[PDB]
Amino acid sequence: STIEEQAKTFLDKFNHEAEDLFYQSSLASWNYNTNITEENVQNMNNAGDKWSAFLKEQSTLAQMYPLQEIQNLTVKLQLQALQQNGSSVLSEDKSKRLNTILNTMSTIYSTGKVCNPDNPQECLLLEPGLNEIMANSLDYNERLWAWESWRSEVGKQLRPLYEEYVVLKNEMARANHYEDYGDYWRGDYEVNGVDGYDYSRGQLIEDVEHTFEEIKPLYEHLHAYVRAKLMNAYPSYISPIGCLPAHLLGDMWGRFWTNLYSLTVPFGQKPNIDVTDAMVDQAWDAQRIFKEAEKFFVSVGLPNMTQGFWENSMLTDPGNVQKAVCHPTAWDLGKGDFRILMCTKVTMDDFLTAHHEMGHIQYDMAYAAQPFLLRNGANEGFHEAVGEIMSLSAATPKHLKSIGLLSPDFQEDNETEINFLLKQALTIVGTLPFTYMLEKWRWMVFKGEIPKDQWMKKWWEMKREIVGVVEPVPHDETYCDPASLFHVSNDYSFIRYYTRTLYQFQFQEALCQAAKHEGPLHKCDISNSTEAGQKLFNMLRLGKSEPWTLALENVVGAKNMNVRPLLNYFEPLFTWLKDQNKNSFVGWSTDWSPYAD
Amino acid sequence: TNLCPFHEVFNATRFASVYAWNRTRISNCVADYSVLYNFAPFFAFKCYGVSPTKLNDLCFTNVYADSFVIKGNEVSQIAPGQTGNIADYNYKLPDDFTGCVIAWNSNKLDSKHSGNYDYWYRSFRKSKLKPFERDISTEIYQAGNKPCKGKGPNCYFPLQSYGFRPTYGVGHQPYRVVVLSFELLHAPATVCGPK
């Protein structure tokens, strides 16, 4: 016998037990997340320990099958996924130290409180805390204090822990035949074996820079437009040719500029689209919202949901006798079990998030026939893109008018379109430079080009160079402000958001061209169309057995990411911003600082 | 009027596995096909070779009945000319089969919490089976090139469990399948239909 038959038998024997063990672990996790008790915690820990022990014992046994003797692509990919050692290459003491550091950082981030200076007994939390302050406030000193206290209290106790974390991660990456942690993170965008579809871990940075070089002018115009109104908001504070303070971007870190819509509205006399009052008047509920979402998903040619979905999902708040987490998540347990946990309220945001969750569920149900090791998306930014392309179609005025939420006497003008485009831009475009700068800084830190005595210096330099935000108070090398974010302290990536932002617009343009739409792109709707549904299902069924380049070519006809759809989408807003800024200055200088006077 | 004992086959408390199925012999009685709607009115019949309308006025010699439990995604493999893991290693039908296949859902009977590991099936074998063949061997399967001694690398157990649960999907639920074969030999036919 050859190696292929032995590998196939091993894979079958592995999957047969892996399915059952993963189902048990997922059921335990669901029982924990639904009801918070101590027995549920014990059961979840036991299930997790059993699953980890199974994954450990199943490793070191697939090493008998070298990859140089396998000619089938599926078996080779499965074996390559199984042969990953991980953190077991290090010693036991270093592994225990790393786990202790991770748990310590998680506990420090999850347990934080800011006390009042004049009253040490008045200590506020973070989420029922500084978020409400940074969200709704029109005071310079209050925002400055809420920023400085938060970045000085929990920004000084994480420097040596993060240094040791970086050292240990670099050692682990070098032990795992990688150059650094950046290569370990970029290894997801790697395809080797198929002629004409290969991808390397160095072309991604080049593509990202090439796309940002074209995205930059729109961000420059948006910043020039926002600064003009910020000057009128806070007099004698904003400079007409200077940068912007970090404590005025809308939130704690300035990731989203959504809260600045109230002050930067183009036309305040025109009404907005809020169907919340209509939903309250018509007395809807979660059942109606989910049934409308199901009707929308069936109108394009997708299968119906299962009875277990309607029988086992939690779509309402249980109350006060039972505690649970209201974070909307999609659960895939296996064996034909799909559930959704969401505390649904009678609003429009929940109506839009329901479509995102249902798109996630449809994607999960798409590749149910693939093997266990391939039951995943072809890339990171695919599930979120599939959800967003559905949310955008559900958030159209035509759909709301057809479902009966908007009166048929609505007069669509140009000012409403401008307001909608600006509201979408303040959310979409405002997060790209921040993510790019953060990821580039993390990559340069992991690579070793930035010495330890220049971390904050290079951080603020890159800030003022790319994002154009200057700090109000200079900080020395004793702070750890970049680690004040959730994803930075919990060991997560950030390029997935950029990839999703590109892929969503690419897929939207592809589907709107396939649906024979005429007119602007922001008015497209894919309702009642089987061609687009089939073209999307052809890609959703592949899963992880095919490279993402071929999956993208089967949809848009391209192998790499592109930025032209976003420009075609925001062209009218670009023209309006040009017309408004014709009598204004564009650009910003890095020489100005709030502490210069 | 003597009726055939269909309650001993359709109203059993415990069924067998797919690798070790039972075969009963029915003779010298009247075949009443109307009591089957009492066990379950929803009986998915599938006749290959004969029609149910012309099946009432025929007389046969011996009627064989087979019973086993499989999943919902494996019901399609119980047919002449199918390929898979059940049709190749557990139970195969000939290409000239003349009978009917009946199946129904038994989720509320053969399903418990914490798993029901009382059903097994064969997955690993050297060759394929022949029509109407049974194998109950429990020897360790050899996949490598070394002599098998015990259990370990490249030496696996040929039996695997199902573990049904009531929360599984409609495809991963237990189903009870009954096969009916009709045989005509050079002997007086003692199995006819009601008049």
Swiss-Prot record, chain A:
Consequence of substituting L73P: Increases slightly the interaction with RBD domain of SARS-CoV-2 spike protein
Induction comment from the UniProt entry of this chain: Up-regulated in failing heart. Expression is induced by IFNA and IFNG. Exposure to cigarette smoke increases expression in lungs. Expression is decreased in nasal and bronchial epithelium of individuals with allergy after allergen challenge. IL13 stimulation decreases expression in nasal and bronchial epithelium.
Cofactor: Zn(2+); chloride
Result for mutant: R174D: No effect on interaction with SARS-CoV spike glycoprotein
Cofactor note (record): Binds 1 zinc ion per subunit. Binds 1 Cl(-) ion per subunit.
Impact when changing P371D: Increases very slightly the interaction with RBD domain of SARS-CoV-2 spike protein
Enzyme class label: hydrolase
Homology family: Belongs to the peptidase M2 family.
Name the UniProt record assigns to this protein: Angiotensin-converting enzyme 2
Gene source species: Homo sapiens
Residues of the full protein shown: 19 to 615 of 805
From Swiss-Prot, chain B:
Integrin-binding motif: annotated segments: 71-73
Residues bearing carbohydrate: N11
Domain BetaCoV S1-CTD: 2-194
Renumbered residue ranges of the record's region Receptor-binding motif: 105-175
UniProt-reported outcome of changing L36I: In strain: Omicron/XBB.1.5, Omicron/EG.5.1
Effect noted on mutating R14T: In strain: Omicron/BQ.1.1, Omicron/XBB.1.5, Omicron/EG.5.1
Region (Receptor-binding domain (RBD)): 1-195
Bridged cysteine pairs (disulfide): C4-C29, C47-C100, C59-C192, C148-C155
Region feature (Immunodominant HLA epitope recognized by the CD8+): 116-124
Stretches for region Disordered: 123-157
Summary of subunit composition and partner proteins: Binds to host ACE2. RBD also interacts with the N-linked glycan on 'Asn-90' of ACE2. Cleavage of S generates a polybasic C-terminal sequence on S1 that binds to host Neuropilin-1 (NRP1) and Neuropilin-2 (NRP2) receptors. Interacts with host integrin alpha-5/beta-1 (ITGA5:ITGB1) and with ACE2 in complex with integrin alpha-5/beta-1 (ITGA5:ITGB1). May interact via cytoplasmic c-terminus with M protein. May interact (via N-terminus) with host bilirubin and biliverdin, thereby preventing antibody binding to the SARS-CoV-2 spike NTD via an allosteric mechanism.
Function: Attaches the virion to the cell membrane by interacting with host receptor, initiating the infection. The major receptor is host ACE2. When S2/S2' has been cleaved, binding to the receptor triggers direct fusion at the cell membrane. When S2/S2' has not been cleaved, binding to the receptor results in internalization of the virus by endocytosis using host TFRC and GRM2 and leading to fusion of the virion membrane with the host endosomal membrane. Alternatively, may use NRP1/NRP2 and integrin as entry receptors.
Protein's recorded name: Spike protein S1
Originating species: Severe acute respiratory syndrome coronavirus 2
Lineage: Viruses, Riboviria, Orthornavirae, Pisuviricota, Pisoniviricetes
Portion of the full sequence shown: 333 to 528 of 1273
